[PDB]
Amino acid sequence: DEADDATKKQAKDTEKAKAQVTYSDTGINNANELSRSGNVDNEGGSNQKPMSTRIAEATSAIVSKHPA
Amino acid sequence: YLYRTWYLAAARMAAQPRTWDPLFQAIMRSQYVTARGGSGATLRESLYAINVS
Amino acid sequence: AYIAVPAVVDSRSSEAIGLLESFGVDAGSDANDVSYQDHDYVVDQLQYMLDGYEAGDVIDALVYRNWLHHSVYCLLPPKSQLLEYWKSNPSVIPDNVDRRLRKRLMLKKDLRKDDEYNQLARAFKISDVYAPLISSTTSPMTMIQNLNQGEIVYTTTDRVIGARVLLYAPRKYYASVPHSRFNVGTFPSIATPKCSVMSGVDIESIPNEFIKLFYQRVKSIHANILNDISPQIVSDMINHVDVYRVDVVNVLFEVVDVADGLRSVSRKLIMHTVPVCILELLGIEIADYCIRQEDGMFTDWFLLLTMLSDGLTDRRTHCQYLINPSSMPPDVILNISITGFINRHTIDVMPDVYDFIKPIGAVLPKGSFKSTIMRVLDSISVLGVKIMPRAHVVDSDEVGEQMEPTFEHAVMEIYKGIAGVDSLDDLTKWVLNSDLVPHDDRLGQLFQAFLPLAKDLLAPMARQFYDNSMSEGRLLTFAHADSELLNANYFGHLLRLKIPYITEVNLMIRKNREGGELFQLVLSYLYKMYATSAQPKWFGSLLRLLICPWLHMEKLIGEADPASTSAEIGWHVPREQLMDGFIPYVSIRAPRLVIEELMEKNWGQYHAQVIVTDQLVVGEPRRVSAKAVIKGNHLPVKLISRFACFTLTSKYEMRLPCGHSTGRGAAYNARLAFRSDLA
Amino acid sequence: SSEIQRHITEFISSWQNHPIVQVSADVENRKTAQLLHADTPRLVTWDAGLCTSFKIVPIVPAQVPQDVLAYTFFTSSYAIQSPFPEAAVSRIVVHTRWASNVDFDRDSSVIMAPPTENNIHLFKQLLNTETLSVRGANPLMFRANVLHMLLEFVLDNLYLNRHTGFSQDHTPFTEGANLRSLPGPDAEKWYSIMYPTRMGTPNVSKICNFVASCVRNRVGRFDRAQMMNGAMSEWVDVFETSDALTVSIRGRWMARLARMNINPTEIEWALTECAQGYVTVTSPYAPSVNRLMPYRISNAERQISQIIRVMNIGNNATVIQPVLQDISVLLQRISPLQIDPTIISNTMSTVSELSPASSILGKLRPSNSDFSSFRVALAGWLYNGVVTTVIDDSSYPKDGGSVTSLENLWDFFILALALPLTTDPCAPVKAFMTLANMMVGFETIPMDNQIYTQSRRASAFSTPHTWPRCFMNIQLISPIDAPILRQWAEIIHRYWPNPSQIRYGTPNVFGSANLFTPPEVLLLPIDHQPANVTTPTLDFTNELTNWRARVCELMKNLVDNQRYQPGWTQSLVSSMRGTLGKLKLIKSMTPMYLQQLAPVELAVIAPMLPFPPFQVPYVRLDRDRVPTMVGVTRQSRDTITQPALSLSTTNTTVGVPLALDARAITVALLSGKYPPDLVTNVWYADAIYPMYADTEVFSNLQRDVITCEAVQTLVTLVAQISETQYPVDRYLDWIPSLRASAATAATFAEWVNTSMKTAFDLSDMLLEPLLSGDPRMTQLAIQYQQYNGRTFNVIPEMPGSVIADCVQLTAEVFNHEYNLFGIARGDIIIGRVQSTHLWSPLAPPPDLVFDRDTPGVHIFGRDCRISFGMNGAAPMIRDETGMMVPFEGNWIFPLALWQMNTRYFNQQFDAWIKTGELRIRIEMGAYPYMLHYYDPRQYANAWNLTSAWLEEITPTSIPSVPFMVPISSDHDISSAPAVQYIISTEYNDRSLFCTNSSSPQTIAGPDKHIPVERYNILTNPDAPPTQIQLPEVVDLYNVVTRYAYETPPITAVVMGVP
Amino acid sequence: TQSLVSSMRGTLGKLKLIKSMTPMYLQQLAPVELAVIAPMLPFPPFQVP
Amino acid sequence: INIDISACDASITWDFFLSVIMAAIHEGVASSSIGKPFMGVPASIVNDESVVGVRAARPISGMQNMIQHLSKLYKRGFSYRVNDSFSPGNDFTHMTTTFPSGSTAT
């Protein structure tokens, strides 16, 4: 994603449909590289249900009410 | 026995490597493209029924 | 992100239809981020490319595509016309091309015979100038690789797949998109870590048959590395109305015997593609139900469900089931309990065999519920239409009842030919033993006598009866075997059919039939032996067409003006020749904007000889019967487009509400003509 | 009419009696498709919900409004969520994946209703097609049905625990512990079921007492492996509601999968070794995120899969033709050679002059056979175990040569050139007898009998028994009578081509499917020799050119004479000699191709190939090492047990010939040429890169795994019910069962096969080769036999199977916890017991039970009779010892006696059981039960239920056993009389969980608190967090590890360098 | 003219190792049924050694 | 002995000859044409139920796709458009099961 976006910005900034100094599809097998993503929270856990919703549910599972 | 005869015939026919080149395919295609009628009308007005020109 | 669905996704229409509520996704909101993709041309390229290459190569290549990486082909003319284009308008020449070749193309000579330029062109090849050049023999894996890496790809052929094809030169030298974070479309890929496939739809139910082949091949090789997500997971991640396309699911239920307050599950089943609209109408949800409600006959909403669908198969042993029609044990289904709904999708209710407007012959086995289904079908009339009146259908026994010795009476006397029987009861005892499944040898000895009665009497009588019936309008006719409609040369659509029950038990349940119940049953065996084995194909396949399109149109034209949304198209005769009145032949119902479009179609190039009579009919509107015989060609369905809900049967008759006097009848050489009001 | 309704019921029964699995068509296209492309199994599946298969259900609701205790006591008036049901009687039932948000469904499920509903349908699945009733089941198939239920139970959870998020606790209920949030629509209900100890303790109720006795700090996550920051944690250990059984099963599954794991570096090395330096691939070098790709397997599995493929392909030739055609097309897209028969015309078109220069090509040519026969012959080298390429009959000289002729001389030349490339062992003797036939009337040789005289056909030979004695003793061919035959014989003996080998493959990642040869080796019928340059130029040093030279020399010696060809002219003789001299030196490159480049291409194609090579040794010219059969065994023979002993007489021969075209092969030999500017390394790099981008072979490996697992599961489960040869422990002997024959064994095997196909999502041909025969005592072995009786066999060792191990573990746990699956163990005692006591019939007092070793019991076995009582005397039944006893006291029956006399005994005994004194102990050993709870404050009588059961017993069925159990109470209750009739004979309340779980105590009826031995790591401060009391308790709460591995495709990690 | 020994040997092996309960039927249960049916026949058995 | 078949065309229909022949030709070709196209016909797919209890979509070949279409033609029979120039007013359409006498395969 980021490599393609950056090479496209390079093409636009050098005013040619085909870039010349690219960041993606180089000769190196850089296949283990990571990046920051919204999918991972700070606890090393998956971010599919947001932390606010997780806390709200975990707290709601313990609340009581008045007796009739 | 009918089934066996036609099955063995089909297997031995399809096994021949001659039936897999473009030349044999094209010969069999052009075998029936003659100057005699083939009722092209009903072909045309049946293709028309599915909106193809 | 990227998500693949079993359907032809398009950026124009798939947003209108949605497809996500179709498969069952709760995307409905101000979502406007699930951007679709154009795969129409990709499916077409796949079809065209399977013509020359091999399916394995093509599919295993197309699976490695990065659909979120824009790219495009552009094909070059062959070398000769290419050089002709180099020469004329020469200021487009890439600099790779040889210095000598450019210096010789820049000349204004006629080039009739340049002794050196011929050599320079002979030794010139296209592959060296344009670097990524696919091939004439590419062996396509490099095609998808080059589409993945790069922006433009150079081909010398047309058989390519993955992106659109653009022209390089003008037309003379040849023969005859933003992202949205939730991109979707058919044709799953494994290019990235974010490509997903939406599960929840079986493989055998995919209707396109090219998407189907692709999914089978890809899922049998890449099963362990694909990312499956159900419709609920997709919903959680996100958060000219066409008729004859209906949403279908199948119901999961099991049999329960609630005797004296003790539940006991007994068997588990799957109803196999009941349409969703009928489940909405009947108000079916997760709960218990009784499917008889009185005297051991089905409650008939259950009968409607079982007749609107394909058949139910046991979930323990994956085989067909054929629920019991009787009320006698070992097996009796008296209480069920629906538990859930699984795979949802759309299907085309219009069968491909039906293209022209002509009669319909529906073959059914003997003991089916033809009488009860007629009784249940003649009542429906949605927009004052009466979609299937009782007078438009021909009973299965009618062709045999119209004989001096009727057919069943003719075959009752068949026991004289046997070596010795002496009576019909002794015949029923000599044939099948102390249950059904008769002796095959004795049944064969009986069939060798039953056959000449069917080839020499029934076929000649039917060959005239079906002609007489075809003269007086389109009719829906039944039979007991396709051989009856094949030997007697029947015109129209021949739809074989079948019911999800054990038809042989109805032949013992019903009482007042000619001959003993055993004789009716042996007769059914004989018809089944006269059957010319072919797939009966699930009676619901027809009833779904009969019912479903009207219910959908009732939502669109539920409250509009009847005068503006209506039409009728029959055979026209001029105001003279009374020594204007038209026979209807069809009754359209559709929105106003489509009636406007149908008003201008030809409708006049179809002719037929109408023969008006002077006979009166007991019905209320004073009308005289008639006949008609189409000449030349039959009305194709394409004229009545997929947006109108027409009728499939009709009687031929004319009404006479002016100067009441019926004179002498005649033939008039009618012409088809559209007939609606002002609208 | 009742006769007519009898007919109707009989027909409906016969209609229900249909078969379920029946293959009645012919399966050969399916075998070929299975051979060329097999469906891949579904191994990796993830589970995001909590792992458990046992759920606590409330059976009877509590009484919140009651007179003794005000409603403000209970924590239901406050809507306080609790981890357990607040009923008055809670039992624990079985429901696999009731809490599993799974990525893939496996269609298996052991779902059970509570004991207060009828579970008899779970035990009348397999062999109860004859059971007419809907509420009955045949007792003789109990342990068969239970084995099938256990197999389903194991197959249902073959999953992989998924890792999904956490959250710091924001309340004082815990010490800020982390809590796993699982996905779903309504996830607020799981935080109270996953954490029984995260709850207040207001009351002195039983739930609160337990939660007060638990330990505080064993909640939520307590261990993780964080490798990179801002990335997913690799795995974690979390406390939560689970159970030891499914935790152990999934642990075994993950261990099995992790043993198969490979990594990108070694995948790179393997692919590079396979491609042999023609295809470079790259792999990353940096810290990674712990991928999972289960592809590596052992050698025994590859060998077993190879044996099964061979026993499918055996003896048909239509299953094997398409494989050879595919290899032919691969050689087409790969090989640089291309044939040019114009070389023959160039060579022959310089002779001045029946014309020798117009025979081979222009005349004696099929005119439709191009040179695909050549590379089909080449591809036949990889498969001389099943396929034996032979020269077609129609390419011989048509009943006699007559060397005086000319076309027959050319036919001999072409057969002699084409024969060495075939793979049948009798090519040398055919090459000899071609000339022997042609030279009839001129030279004679002694034969072996008068059937195979010298005037036979050369093709009618080809068995090692038919080689002439004079061909083995060259001394018998006199050098005076038959000099040409003598010379041709010794030429064949000396200068025939020699076998060699190429050593393909790499067994580090891939296994080694070789059976009768060492691993990573490839036998060839000719000598291989690597090339020294990449820009090839012509040479003449090789076996094929030496063979052509020898043949041309002998034909010169044959044609030079006016002794064989009488009428030929000197001009014709000189023309023939010159044609032979030039054809000896034709400029063809096919021989150097065959010795320098063809074996390299075969070795490069061999690894990437759907059906691995299957070779036996290429024996050159001795009978004693000529293979005369290759056979496979799939079962033993007798009481004998050892494969090395039964293999010689329980094998099936495999293999089939395949004709070729001598014309095509010889012309391809004579006319070969490379392109003008060939550079070897560039050409092969380009032509070989495309077929190392696909990964189909790895999925083949995974299917080999699944095949071996299925075979082992079959042998174990079949040995469970029928006597076999393999040693296995048996736990389910106490369940009744049937005396199994081959038919019932085959049926049970079909059910196992269908279940294992349904799981793993595969559509075709798993276990059918074994199921064709008798599966009671199976085995897999293969052998071939030489000519001199020397035999070689291969008995691959059966590697372990995780699925069979887990099935055995599940049975070993069922042996202790049979009550949870609805089964009860022991016999039952019938006879009324009227009293106000509140003991539970599933735990009776010991003084009401008797057995065989009791003073005063009568024991009724077979050959018993009843005699009426005349004039007011009691009737009598015959004891097993021969006595006659009245209808009183307590007795002992087998169940089969009652089943076989069900109606004659009901009428005679029911009046005495009910109001008399008779008490009978039916002997069942195992039976499903059904509970009926009642209010103890009112009259209750079980005679209706017990009489329904007794009258319902049938010679081939019994319904469930109805027990009448009282209801527990929290306060005093007045008593009332209850009348019992059926009581168990041993403790069967192993399923009762808790009674009156929301009140301070139980005061009347069955009492028991929450089982403190289950929740062991909570109630015991000194126990390690990982202890499990598995074979006797499931513990219902324990530590469970959760993974976050990713499974990318191989092509996304190992790139290609195009 | 071609080696059919492999195909012949394989089919003979199949016929040899086919599973058929008919031999054990004839050898175990047929005599019992014959001895159960014999004394009830109208024309009782008339055998020669 | 002189043997002739009376009405040979009308005696070859789907219930005895064409059904068996189509099943035979559809099964025999399956082995050596596993994924290839025949004369401009694709490599379509179809689900089978020949084995009891199993129901799975199985790929087929071009030469089998053609047998599928040809079978769905032979099952219904043929419809002949008659329009004679000897009787004014006869242009009906007629449908038979008689095997055609104009096909290459006749």
Ligand SMILES: O=c1ccn([C@@H]2O[C@H](COP(=O)(O)OP(=O)(O)OP(=O)(O)O)[C@@H](O)[C@H]2O)c(=O)[nH]1
């Ligand atoms: O007009 C037709 C006559 C027959 N021939 C071809 O010959 C084949 C058989 O021809 P027919 O079917 O017409 O002979 P027949 O039954 O009338 O014989 P009889 O009853 O008179 O004894 C058919 O397959 C048809 O294609 C046609 O090419 N031209």
